[PDB]
Amino acid sequence: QVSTEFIPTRIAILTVSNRRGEEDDTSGHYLRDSAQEAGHHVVDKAIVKENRYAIRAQVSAWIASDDVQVVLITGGTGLTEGDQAPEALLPLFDREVEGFGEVFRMLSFEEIGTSTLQSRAVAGVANKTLILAMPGSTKACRTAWENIIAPQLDARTRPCNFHPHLKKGS
């Protein structure tokens, strides 16, 4: 249930962008730096285009892996044709974690108001791999990381958190 100690988790980070490469992947860099600073282990990282098959390929590999416990995705949750992260990912879930999108939208409403409507953040679990998909904006990633994700990936957080139920290595 609740650990006396912090327990590093193994995290993979996906950026979904048509144009950004590693050089200007500001949100992916933020997430990687923030995860490492908190003491987690970023075991893999990729950037893919706004393509549902590319996303499914990379996320399916991490879902099936022995080592990846958490997947963070940034980008592709918007409302236009090319935004495909929810379309890609929802079919891969065993269960949806409805609380992630809801709390994210609640906290975002406070920070950016009605613009919260323009994103479709979503989370789920597949093969005991937690999948968290958030907007491409670094500001959004910060809100999600600081206020939702980091707390829930800390095995000490009360009354409960993800740790006990993440995929065991092996």
Added chain:
Amino acid sequence: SQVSTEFIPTRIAILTVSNRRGEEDDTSGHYLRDSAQEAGHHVVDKAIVKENRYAIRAQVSAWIASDDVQVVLITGGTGLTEGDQAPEALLPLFDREVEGFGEVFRMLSFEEIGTSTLQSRAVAGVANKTLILAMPGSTKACRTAWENIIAPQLDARTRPCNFHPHLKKGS
């Protein structure tokens, strides 16, 4: 529409879904590989995975997204128990279902093996212009599917129409 005068090879990946069988035991996958090669197609990849939806999704997703794989042939895991996961793995990955494959296969199978046909759930779909055909683990079932359904539809010469015009173009 669209019929070719010449045979045009397709690029095929073959998946066997089995807990126990390794390559030496893999009669159906060998059958599909050999039949595809004999017909002139190129088998560009082959894998064996356990009866695990995630392993199936990882491999089939890689092939869907690939530049080269136009057709995925899967054998195994279409039965009616808890451990058979091929349809459950695959259906969520499809853009569209190819309803005629399962239906024609079941017609042919009922004639061949009778009511035992009910014990399998053959299914096909397309994803990213990649044709995915999932058939039972038995070699007899693979022969019936290949000879009477799949080979003709993968032959660009087949009238009145076939898959060729619409499979994923190479880069």
